[PDB]
Amino acid sequence: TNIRKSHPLMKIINNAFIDLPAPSNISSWWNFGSLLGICLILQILTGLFLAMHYTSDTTTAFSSVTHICRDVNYGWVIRYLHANGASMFFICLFIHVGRGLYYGSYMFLETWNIGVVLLFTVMATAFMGYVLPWGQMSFWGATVITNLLSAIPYIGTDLVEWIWGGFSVDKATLTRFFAFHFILPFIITALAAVHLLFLHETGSNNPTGISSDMDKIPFHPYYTIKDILGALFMMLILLILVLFSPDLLGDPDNYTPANPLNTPPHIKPEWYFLFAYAILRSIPNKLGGVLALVASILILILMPMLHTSKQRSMMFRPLSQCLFWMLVADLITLTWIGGQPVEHPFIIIGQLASILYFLIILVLMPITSIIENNLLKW
Amino acid sequence: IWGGFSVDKATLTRFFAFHFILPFIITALAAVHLLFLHETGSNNPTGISSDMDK
Amino acid sequence: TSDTTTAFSSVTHICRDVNYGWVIRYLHANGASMFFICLFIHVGRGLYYGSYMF
Amino acid sequence: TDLELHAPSYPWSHRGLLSSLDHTSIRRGFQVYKQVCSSCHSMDYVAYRHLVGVCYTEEEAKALAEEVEVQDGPNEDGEMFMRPGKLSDYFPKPYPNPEAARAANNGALPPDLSYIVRARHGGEDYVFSLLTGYCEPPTGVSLREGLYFNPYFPGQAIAMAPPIYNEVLEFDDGTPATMSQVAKDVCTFLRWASEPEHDHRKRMGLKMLMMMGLLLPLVYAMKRHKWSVLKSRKLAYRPPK
Amino acid sequence: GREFGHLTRMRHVITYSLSPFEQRAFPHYFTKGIPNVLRRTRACILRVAPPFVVFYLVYTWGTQEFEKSKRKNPAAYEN
Amino acid sequence: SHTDIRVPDFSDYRRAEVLDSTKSSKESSDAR
Amino acid sequence: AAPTLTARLYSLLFRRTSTFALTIAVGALFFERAFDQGADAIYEHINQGKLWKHIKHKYENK
Amino acid sequence: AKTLLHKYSDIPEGTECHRKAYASTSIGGATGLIVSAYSIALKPPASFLEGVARTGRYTFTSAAIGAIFGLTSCISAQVREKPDDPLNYFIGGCAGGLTLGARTRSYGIGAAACAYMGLTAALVKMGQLEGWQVFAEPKV
Amino acid sequence: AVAASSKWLEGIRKWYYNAAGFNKLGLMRDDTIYEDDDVKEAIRRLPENLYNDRVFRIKRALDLTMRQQILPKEQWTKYEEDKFYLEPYLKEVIRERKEREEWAKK
Amino acid sequence: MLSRFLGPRYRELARNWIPTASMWGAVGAVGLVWATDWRLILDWVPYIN
Amino acid sequence: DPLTTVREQCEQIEKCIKARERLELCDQRVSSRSQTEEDCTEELFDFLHARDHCVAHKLFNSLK
Ligand SMILES: CCCCCCCCCCCCCCCCC[C@@H](O)O[C@H](CO[C@H](O)CCCCCCCCCCCCCCC)COP(=O)(O)OCC[N+](C)(C)C
Ligand code: HEC
Ligand code: HEM
Ligand code: HEM
């Protein structure tokens, strides 16, 4: 009789996107994860239309990219949409991590960890797709960044030899990256579905942080139109950043064809990695730079154990919220330091920025959480 | 589908990426196919339900 | 990888130049019709025992 | 360790966010490419396609394309000969190999026109800047004999001899050829070559803003419309006791 | 499941709504919100501004300073 | 109990056309 | 008061969903052409003279 | 000391906004300590902790005013790049009152402070441009 | 060891009491604490007269934040007024968790 | 916090289950010796080659 | 040529003159000796940046 409750598949969608109970007091920050869900498919079709021309050969690829930007009927829009749109993906993704950390939606442990693995996956897809376009930054960037694993006392230098499929970057290595780059996003989708599947059966977080189980509210009448509006406005951000700022988002230099011979002045890694790359400047020994590099993302896992303040969130606690903003500011620091060509003052600033970047959460946050607990019988 | 008039590199590229993505849709629909199968139960050679004997 | 140009030269790149490349391409080419050996038989038995009562 | 000189931004006509490149200075800059700009460098990514819609009718685009003729390939025997010049043909091959240019240019290959705007930081304005940057060396700085000192080059000394000069090339338009205005025609033409879709893209972009503007308030009005029920509501608590 | 039909205990709390069509979309939508916006503003600018201003200051600090270690060199390297 | 409950004002939220207590709602269903 | 032209206009196309979709379709058909050509003539009008369509005259019909 | 104003005086122009802003912060801090000093002197706070509370108040406020004034002024100089006309300070002048407006939590006093502090600063710059003597030497 | 200075502690705990926004929404301090399963079972311990009060106040605040508009200036909670009702419940939850653990360790 | 694990019954569990830990760890060690062609321990055993 | 005309017109402004004298000064600090280490040409850069900073608003005052 009941139609949505008829078909079991429909039963699943109705347990979710049709009418899962939701907190009412939700703001835009929660709209952002849905925005990630928006961006993902868009990149997928966009990359599909791009995959209708691009080649993974060392030689013939770049000419095909020029086939895209000039030959293809409105495909230039597609090209920039896939690029800049990926940029937007990382935009929203960062806000999203900030949210989950801020309102303590990391309290959903398994959901959180799937978010983490999803994050590393997105990072890899980013890097390799960035290698694909096939230009100066593509080449030397991929080479340099790949070199990092050679910091391993035995295995890693061997391992780089294994990725490259040869002595150096080549149609081997390039087709390698084209394929990994292709296979991962579809993995990201399944991890997303699994991710939401963890989310449904714990209930959603609320801006208050404190449970709103008593105030749970239907999804379809309300949040669907909300997120539609949010996606339409991100569509504004993106289309205005593409039809009016076609190029600025990235790093020109790829626009030069790659030469193993000819070598670029500065080889700044593309911007989302800049803080990460900044940490490569942080310390002597390339090995420890790789260790801290992976640790920069890994460290998130500590937080749910490191968390101890009675809030499940961070909005009624401007105290620890201040440490939070110090940490965000610190990320801005590692960012802009990573953007500049290497220099000594930048070196010392990057050092202390890194030490404090770990210590706000390994020292300040838990213990100030303790004193904050002492102040009001927590 | 040709991407133009002739049987070209563009067209092979089409069939490439299409062949290169389409099976994932296949594994998806297959998992959905099992999802239809779940509560319905299976079947027997006899054609009589083994509801008592699963 | 292929365009018009890269094509059969690259398939042969597999067939010889790639390590174990003949191994894989031979497995794959015979993996198809075998996949159908599972398939049309599964469709046949499916038409037979009336599991399409589901 | 030495700094490259930092080219100041200049107010070109297209830098207006609504502004489009005109087909004019692009045409005259194309006349700058037709002769003097065959020192090469390159434009091989772009054929005489694109040139049709900007300034040139089909038969005139072909007429423009017979001006020079790249080799036809071998046929059934009959190898290597010259096709008269359809627009489908590319711009002339700069050299049989770039290495020949390197022999022709102290081993430093002259870069393709197509990305030089897009690739270089400071972009088209920088290209207009280096053309006109040939300042004399100050005392005590070394230079290679082929080099022609210019701060805008990162190594301070570009191998290139200033192709530009006063009255470089009289235009078919008959318009005067000061090194300034002709160079502006150059980089305008480059920016054309750099972004062929640009003038067309702005129209699409402007159109989208209106669409977005209309959509942004209306859909928001529907959100207010469906959330009004929740925003409005009053609640009360009346204990049974 | 955890769907509405069976959840938390809640009692003699009551709702008063309105049909959307019977009420206009923008009830004093301007005048009501501005003091709210501004009060939220004065509330959190105190906890948001200082990281960003400190960042901007360090930005021009290192940029200008190193620039002074940069453009000014020939005098710094002496004759 | 059922007696002392009451509906607090919403007129500030109400549409102007239905703002008064005398008029037909049905008269205004079309415009609204 | 007497119903607004908008009011009776509800009782017309809006209340019935098929006719509602219909007016959405005709409305799209008009909004398309009118807005499209509006963006045309206006874009033609703003940064005037940058256009070669008006500069076709140097080389058309002799 | 006069050496301190002399420190602030060598702006130059508006280059390195921080270098200037620190000095303005210094002047604001000085005046804050003086005002706090007479205030404590003539309004016996009772319970000394309240007295340091008072001086903390005034000192921090005036220091803040000086900071924000200085940096908005130099930033305007480094942005408009006019950069020499008196209006270049006036924004900062107008800005300064708002700072004062914030601590007092009142639109009124903040509003008035905007206007008058602005005009005063503008007159100061105008004076640096014109060599107005305020305390002219006996000369005659 | 603190004693004479304690006044000032209370003089900032109140500021700290102001530092949190819950008073602006007027919620009980006990409401703020995260619900892990054990404290949830402590919630289960509550009398209905106290329970529904909590639930209602929470829903009020939840409605407010949806509007973002703050609870009215008059109603804002005093530091004294906020009964810390959950204390026996949670402290027994601690005593019992640490109990069964205290046996579990031997 | 973490003191709860620090008990004689749990240290007992440590003493009881440790040999087994050595067992499985040695098993996976040998698996590393084999599957990865870890010749360094393949070299420890003469029978190889 | 109107190009360079405007260049020197920019050089009318005291910024280009003070940069000009400073240019001559460092250039003679190098000219002072054959052994001189200094890259006075950097000061030529410093001259040119303010110079074309003035050219920046005037170069297209030259347009036909
Ligand atoms: C993922 C990457 C980004 C995606 C980018 C796309 C962004 C899209 C965002 C655009 C926003 C779309 C808004 C949707 C409008 C309606 C939403 C919904 O809330 O409205 C419903 C109403 O639905 C609409 O009224 C139905 C309109 C039917 C028009 C269908 C469009 C047909 C398009 C077909 C595609 C053609 C192209 C095919 C190419 C192959 C609710 O009904 P109600 O509010 O109660 O009022 C009607 C009540 N009645 C029946 C009594 C009158
Ligand atoms: C002197 C021979 C020659 C002349 C005449 C000539 N080109 Fe060049 N051009 C070169 C070479 C070689 C270089 C780079 C030399 C070097 O970098 O050391 C160069 C450099 C350039 C650069 C900047 C490259 C860079 O790295 O900064 C531009 C822009 C440029 N030329 C424009 C042109 C164009 C377009 C033409 C028409 C083809 C032209 N000049 C005429 C060969 C020439
Ligand atoms: C694009 C891939 C991702 C999808 C589809 C996804 C699902 C998104 C979305 C849709 C939400 C739910 C909230 C909402 O949007 O309304 C959020 C679920 C969640 N995701 Fe992910 N996520 C993704 C990547 C990540 C990453 C990298 C992290 C960081 C660890 C992460 C942490 C969370 C959390 C904590 C929730 C629970 C929602 C909540 O409690 O508010 N997500 N994200
Ligand atoms: C969110 C995950 C993804 C990321 C981060 C990613 C990297 C994005 C980005 C960054 C571009 C690069 C464009 C450029 O740098 O110029 C593009 C690289 C590429 N991606 Fe992916 N991609 C992602 C998912 C896909 C999918 C699903 C497809 C195919 C269906 C795809 C096909 C391409 C192609 C062809 C390029 C190279 C384009 C170029 O040369 O400019 N991508 N995508």
Position F1: which residue type? Answer: S
> What phi, psi does D90 have (nearest 5°)?
-80, 175
Q: What single-letter DSSP state applies at residue B8? A: -
Chain E: residue whose CA lies nearest to D235: E15
- Cα dist from E46 to A208, E41, H72, I19, I20, whole Å: 21, 9, 18, 12, 14
F14 three-class SS: strand
Give the Cβ contact number of residue H39 at 10 Å: 15
Residue recorded with tokens 């909670």 = I77
> Who's near D30: CB < 8 A, 6+ residues apart?
D51, D55, D189, D192
Closest to D184 in 3D by CA, of D176, A318, A180: D176
Distance of CA D63 to the CA centre of its chain: 24
Atom of ligand 3 nearest to the CA of A39: 1
Q: What are the phi and psi torsion angles at A33 (to 5°)?
A: -65, -40
3-state secondary structure chain A: CCCCCCCHHHHHHHCCCCCCCECCCCCHHHHHHHHHHHHHHHHHHHHHHHCCCCCCCCCCHHHHHHHHHHHCCCHHHHHHHHHHHHHHHHHHHHHHHHHHHHCCHHHCHHHHHHHHHHHHHHHHHHHHHHHCCCCHHHHHHHHHHHHHHHHCCCHHHHHHHHHHCCCCCCHHHHHHHHHHHHHHHHHHHHHHHHHHHHHHCCCCCCCCCCCCHHHCECHHHHHHHHHHHHHHHHHHHHHHHHHCCCCCCCCCCCCCCCCCCCCCCCCCCCHHHHHHHHHHCCCCCHHHHHHHHHHHHHHHHHHHHHCCCCCCCCCCCHHHHHHHHHHHHHHHHHHHHHHCCCCHHHHHHHHHHHHHHHHHHHHHHHHHHHHHHHHCCC
With contact defined as beta carbons under 8 Å apart, do A119 and A341 qualify? no
Ligand lying closest to the C-alpha of residue D223 = 1
Q: Could you count the other beta carbons within 10 Å of the beta carbon of residue I97? A: 12
Tell me the CA–centroid distance for residue A235 and ligand 3, in Å.
Answer: 20
**Parallel, antiparallel, or unpaired for β D234-237 and D157-158?**
unpaired
Q: Rounded to an integer, what distance in angstroms lies between the CA atom of residue A160 and that of residue A166?
A: 9
CA-closest candidate to residue H59, choices H41, H39, H82:
H39
Which residue of B lies nearest to A60 if distances are taken between CA atoms? Answer: B9
Cα separation, A184 vs A162, in Å, equals 19
In angstroms, how far is CA D3 from the centroid of its own chain?
A: 26
**Are β-strands E13-16 and D157-158 bridged in parallel, bridged antiparallel, or unpaired?**
unpaired
Q: Which string of DSSP letters, residue by residue, matches chain D? A: -PPPP-PPP---GGGSSS----HHHHHHHHHHHHTTTTSS-B-TT-BSSSHHHHH--HHHHHHHHTTS-PEEPPBSB---EE----TTSBSPPS-SSHHHHHHHTTT-PPPBSTTHHHHSTTHHHHHHHHHT--PPPPTT----TT-EE-TTSTTSEES------TT----TT-----HHHHHHHHHHHHHHHH-TTHHHHHHHHHHHHHHHHHHHHHHHHHHHHHHHHHHH-EEEE----
- Which among A50, A56, A293, A287 is positioned nearest to A165, based on CA atoms? A56
Q: D161 to chain K nearest CA, in Å?
A: 19
Chain H residue numbers touching E60 (CB-CB < 8 A): 16-18
E contact test, residue of H13, H16, H68 with most E CBs within 10 A = H16
Q: Which of A351, A285, A11, A305 is nearest to A152 (CA)?
A: A285
- Per DSSP, G2 falls in state P
- Cα A325 to the center of its chain, rounded Å: 20
Six token digits for residue A1? 């009789």
Query: What is the DSSP code (8-state) at residue B6?
Result: S
E runs forming strands in C1-54: none
Pull the structure tokens for residue D51.
Answer: 């040139």
Quote the CA–CA distance of A13 and A363 in Å, as a whole number: 44
Q: Give the 3-state secondary structure of residue G45.
A: helix
What three-state secondary structure class fits E13?
strand
HSE-up of residue D193 (Cα within 13 Å, Cβ side): 28
Nearest Cα residue to H81 out of H23, H20, H15? H15
Q: Is the CB of A112 under 6 A from ligand 3?
A: yes
Which position has the token pair 């299409």?
B18
Question: What residue's CA is closest to ligand 1, atom 50?
Answer: G17
Cβ contact H–F (≥3 pairs, < 8 Å): no
Distance from CA of D240 to the nearest CA of F (A): 8
D175 in Cβ contact with D169 (< 8 Å) = no
F18 Cβ contact list (under 8 Å, min separation 6): E22, F25, F28, F32
The minimal CB distance from D121 to the residues A221, A232, A252 is found for A252
Ligand nearest to the CA of A208: 3
Whole-number Å distance, alpha carbon H129 to ligand 2 midpoint, is: 49
Smallest Cα–Cα separation from D186: which of D31, D16, D53? D31
In the beta sheet, which residues pair with residue A340?
Answer: none
Write the CB contacts of D42 (distance below 8 Å, at least 6 apart in sequence): D91, D94, D110, D111, D112, D113, D114
Interface test with D, best of K38, K43, K52, K57 (most D CBs within 10 A): K52
Query: How many angstroms away from the CA of B1 is the closest CA of chain C?
Result: 16
Tell if the CB–CB gap between A175 and C1 is shorter than 8 Å.
yes
Give A26's contacts in chain I (Cβ within 8 Å). 66
D112 closest CA partner among D166, D196, D45: D45
Q: Do A206 and I84 touch (CB under 8 A)?
A: no
Q: Which of left, alpha, beta for D40 (phi over 0: left; psi -120 to 50: alpha)?
A: left
CA atoms within 13 A on the CB side of A365: 26
- I100 vs J: CB within 8 A: no
Tokens describing residue H95: 């800005």
Residue with tokens 């070669």: G52
Contact K14, K20 (CB under 8 A): no
Pairing of strands D234-237, D148-149: unpaired
Q: Rounded to whole angstroms, how far apart are CA atoms H131 and D36?
A: 59
> Of ligand 1's atoms, which has the minimum distance to the CA of residue G25?
29
Q: Is E55 exposed, middle or buried (0-12, 13-18, 19+ CB in 10 A)?
A: middle
Instruction: Say yes or no: D236 contacts chain F, CB-CB below 8 A.
Output: yes
Which DSSP category does C14 fall into?
Answer: I
Distance, in Å, from the CA atom of A134 to the CA atom of A57, rounded to the nearest integer, reads 9
- Among E8, E13, E36, the residue with its CB nearest the CB of I56 is E13
Which of F5, F12, F25 lies nearest to residue E27, judging by beta carbons?
F12
Inter-chain residue contact A345 with E66, CB threshold 8 Å: yes
- Helix H or strand E segment including C9: helix C7-12
D90 forms beta bridges with D47
Enter the DSSP assignment of K50.
Answer: H
Burial of A227 (0-12, 13-18, 19+ CB in 10 A): buried
In contact, D117 and D194? CB cutoff 8 Å? yes
Which residues' Cβ are closer than 6 Å to ligand 4? A 43-44, 47-48, 50-51, 54, 65, 79, 82-83, 86, 89, 125-126, 129-130, 132-133, 185
Distance D231 CA to ligand 3 centre (A): 27
Q: Are I85 and I30 in contact (CB under 8 A)?
A: yes
Confirm whether residue C9 is marked as ligand binding.
Answer: no
Reduced to 3 states (helix: H, G, I; strand: E, B; else coil), residue E15 is strand
Experimental method: cryo-EM
- CA dist., res. D7 & res. D117, Å (int): 14
How many CA atoms within 13 Å lie on the side-chain side of H38? 5
Nearest to residue A324, comparing CAs of A338, A307, A336? A307
3-state secondary structure of G15: coil
| The residue to which tokens 């920046």 are assigned | K56
List, in sequence order, every residue forming a beta bridge with D234; answer none if it has no partner: E16
Please identify which residue in the block is written with the tokens 């069939």.
Answer: B15
**Residue A21 Rama label (left phi>0; alpha psi -120 to 50; beta):** beta
User: Taking a C-beta distance cutoff of 8 angstroms, is the pair A334, A275 a contact?
Assistant: yes
Residue closest to D141 by CA, chosen among E79, K36, K49: K36
Question: In b/e form, how buried is each residue of J19-38, taking b as 16+ CB within 10 angstroms?
Answer: eeeeeeeeeeeeeebeeeee
The terminus-to-terminus CA distance of chain F in angstroms comes to: 35
Rounded to the nearest whole angstrom, what is the distance from the C-alpha of residue G21 to the centroid of ligand 1? 10
CA distance A236 to A228: 12
CA distance H35 to H55: 8
Nearest-CA distance D227 → chain G (Å): 22
How many angstroms separate the CA atoms of D24 and D14, rounded? 13
Rounded to 10 degrees, what is the CA torsion of D148, D151, D157, D159? -60
E41: contact with H, CB 8 A cutoff: no
Give residue G15's region: left, alpha or beta (phi > 0; psi -120 to 50). Answer: alpha
Q: Exposed, middle or buried, H110 (CB in 10 Å: 0-12/13-18/19+)?
A: middle
Closest by Cβ to E36, choosing from I48, I56, I68: I68
Sorted by sequence, the CB contacts under 8 Å of residue C36 that are 6+ apart come out as none
C-beta neighbour count of A251 within 10 angstroms: 21
Residues contributing to the annotated binding site of A for a ubiquinone:
200
The runs of H, that is alpha helices, within I2-104 are: 6-19, 22-25, 29-32, 37-44, 48-67, 87-104
Instruction: Measure the CA–CA gap between H5 and C13, rounded to whole angstroms.
Output: 79
Q: How far apart are CA C21 and CA C16, in angstroms?
A: 6
The alpha carbon dihedral of E6, E9, E10, E12 has a sign of positive
Residue A302 backbone phi and psi in degrees, to 5: -65, -30
Task: Give CA–CA dist D156/D149, Å, rounded.
Answer: 6
Which residues are CB-neighbours of K1 under 8 A, at least 6 positions away? D166, D178, D179, D180
Q: Determine the distance from the C-alpha atom of residue A20 to the mean position of all C-alpha atoms in its chain, rounded to a whole number.
A: 27
**Closest C-alpha to ligand 4, atom 15:** A130
Tell me the catalytic residues of A: 200, 204, 226-227, 270
CA distance A364 to A67: 54
- With b for 16 or more beta-carbon neighbours within 10 A and e for fewer, the A282-304 pattern comes to bbeebeebbebbeebeeebeebe
* Residue A275 C-alpha from the chain's centroid: 13
CA distance K42 to D2: 8
- Say whether E23 sits in a helix, a strand or coil: strand
Quick one: which of A360, A315, A339 has its CA closest to A102? A315
Chain gaps in chain G, named by the residue before each (C–N > 2.5 Å): none
Instruction: Give me H106's structure tokens.
Output: 């009142």
Chain A residues with beta carbon closer than 8 angstroms to that of D154: 265
Burial class (CB in 10 A: 0-12, 13-18, 19+), A272: buried
The size of chain C, in residues, is 54
Q: Kindly give, in sequence order, each residue whose CB lies less than 8 Å from that of residue H1, ignoring residues fewer than 6 positions away.
A: none
Which residues, 6+ apart, have CB-to-CB distance to D78 below 8 Å? none
First to last CA, chain A: 52
A108: exposed, middle or buried (Cβ count in 10 Å: 0-12, 13-18, 19+) = buried
| Nearest alpha carbon to residue E77 among D6, D2, K16, D138 | D2
Could G39 and D19 be called an inter-chain contact, meaning their C-beta atoms sit closer than 8 Å?
no
Positive/negative CA dihedral, D192, D197, D202, D203: positive
Instruction: Collect all residues of chain E within an 8 Å Cβ-Cβ radius of residue A336.
Output: 59
User: Using DSSP, how many helices (H) and how many strands (E) does chain E show?
Assistant: 2, 1
Residue carrying the six token digits 């903003």: A325
For chain H, the three-class secondary structure string (H helix, E strand, C coil) is CHHHHHHHHCCCCCCCHHHHHHHHHHHHHHHHHHHHHHHHHHCCCCCHHHHHHHHHHHHHHHHHHHHHHHHHHHHHHHHHCCCCCCHHHHHHHHHHHHHHHHHCCCHHHHHHHHHHHHHHHHHHHHHHHHCCCCCCCCCC
Cβ-based contacts of G44 with chain D (< 8 Å): none
**φ and ψ at A52, to 5 degrees?**
-90, 5
Residues of A in contact with E59 (CB under 8 A): 336
Q: Assign 3-class secondary structure to I67-82.
A: HCCCCCHHHCCCCCCC
Alpha-carbon torsion, ordered C41, C45, C48, C51, to 10 deg = -140
Q: Is D113 in the pocket of ligand 2 (CB under 6 A)?
A: yes
Handedness of CA D197, D198, D200, D204 (dihedral sign): positive
Interface test with E, best of K34, K42, K43, K47 (most E CBs within 10 A): K42
Residue E4's contacts (CB-CB under 8 Å, 6 or more residues apart) are A21, A216
Q: Is the dihedral of CA J14, J16, J18, J21 positive or negative?
A: negative
Distance separating alpha carbons of residues D133 and K4, to the nearest angstrom: 11
Q: Which helix (H) or strand (E) holds E14?
A: strand E13-16
Residue K30 · residue K38 · CB < 8 Å? yes
Q: Please give the torsion angle defined by the CA atoms of residues A67, A73, A79 and A84, in that order, rounded to the nearest 10 degrees.
A: 150
Greatest Cα pair distance, chain E, in angstroms, is: 90
E59: helix, strand or coil: helix
Nearest to E79 among K36, K42, K43 (CB): K36
How many angstroms separate the CA atoms of A210 and E41, rounded? Answer: 23
Beta bridge partners of residue E23, listed in sequence order: F14
Please state the separation of Cα B26 from the chain's center in Å.
3
Is D225 in Cβ contact with E25 (below 8 Å)? yes
Q: Is D7 in the pocket of ligand 2 (CB under 6 A)?
A: no
Resolution in units of Å: 4.0
- Supply the DSSP symbol for G14: I
Measured from the Cα of A51, ligand 4's closest atom is 35
Is residue E33 a contact partner of residue D231, using CB atoms and an 8 Å limit? Answer: no
| H27 to D43, D146, H1: CA distances (angstroms) | 62, 59, 10
| Chain A residues within an 8 Å CB radius of B25 | none
Q: How far, in Å, are H6, H30, H41, K1 from residue H1 at the CA level? A: 9, 10, 22, 55
D108 lines ligand 2 (CB under 6 A): yes
Among the partner-chain residues B14, B20, B39, the one whose CB lies closest to the CB of A8 is B39
